[model samples]
Target: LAAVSVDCSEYPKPACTLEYRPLCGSDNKTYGNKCNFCNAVVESNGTLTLSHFGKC
Candidate 1:
């Protein structure tokens, strides 16, 4: 069972569902479903990254 890629296919309606913002200055903002924190970063050096999206 090595299949948990974590894309969720935009889950139940409206291009999946998950949103959060915060981590640039520290405030704490987060949502749920997929892209769930720190604006999903386009570049992160915060220890580890390469977040989730389509096209695995």
Candidate 2:
């Protein structure tokens, strides 16, 4: 799948697929996928956002 909404609030520890659907995040970081992005944000009071789709 190209895109999927990873419900970070539910998955305490996200387990993502090997799919390389990049998510350009609120922090302007290159996230590997939907799940990974949510996984990173939960690490802090981190923001939930995306500047643009695909690899930045």
Best by TM-score: 2
lDDT of 2 by residue, 4-45 (tens): 345567444536688898877767788897777767767644
Question: For each candidate, what is the lDDT?
Answer: 0.31, 0.68
Assess every candidate by TM-score.
Answer: 0.19, 0.64
**lDDT string, candidate 1, 1-56, tens digits:** 54323332332342434343212212222234245432342223232232332322
Error of 2 at 48 (Å): 4.4
lDDT of 2 at 48: 63
Candidate 1 TM-score to native? 0.19
Worst 10 residues of 2 by lDDT: 3-12
In candidate 1, stretches whose alpha carbon ends up further than 4 angstroms from where it belongs are 1-14, 17-27, 36-39, 43-56
